[PDB]
Design a protein around this ligand. Sequence first.
Ligand SMILES: [Cu+2]
Length: 91
Amino acid sequence: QTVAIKMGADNGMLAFEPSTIEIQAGDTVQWVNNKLAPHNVVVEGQPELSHKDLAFSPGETFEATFSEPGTYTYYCEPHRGAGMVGKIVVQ
Ligand SMILES: [Cu+2]
């Protein structure tokens, strides 16, 4: 299935929302540029699931399919210092 994660929280925080999500192996995650762009997504240790190019416009989306179970930490480069870091748990 496909699950969505907002980049920039609805309340104005520099965060992914939800900041932690659990999915099943084979599921696709779609990140959607929400507020306080630009943002990107670097998945630690996983260059193939990462999207280093910045997203500037609201609604811009990009996806990654997680085929291996495990816990993945990811972050937004420009806002990493502000705590914009997320976690994906693949069951
Ligand atoms: Cu960001």
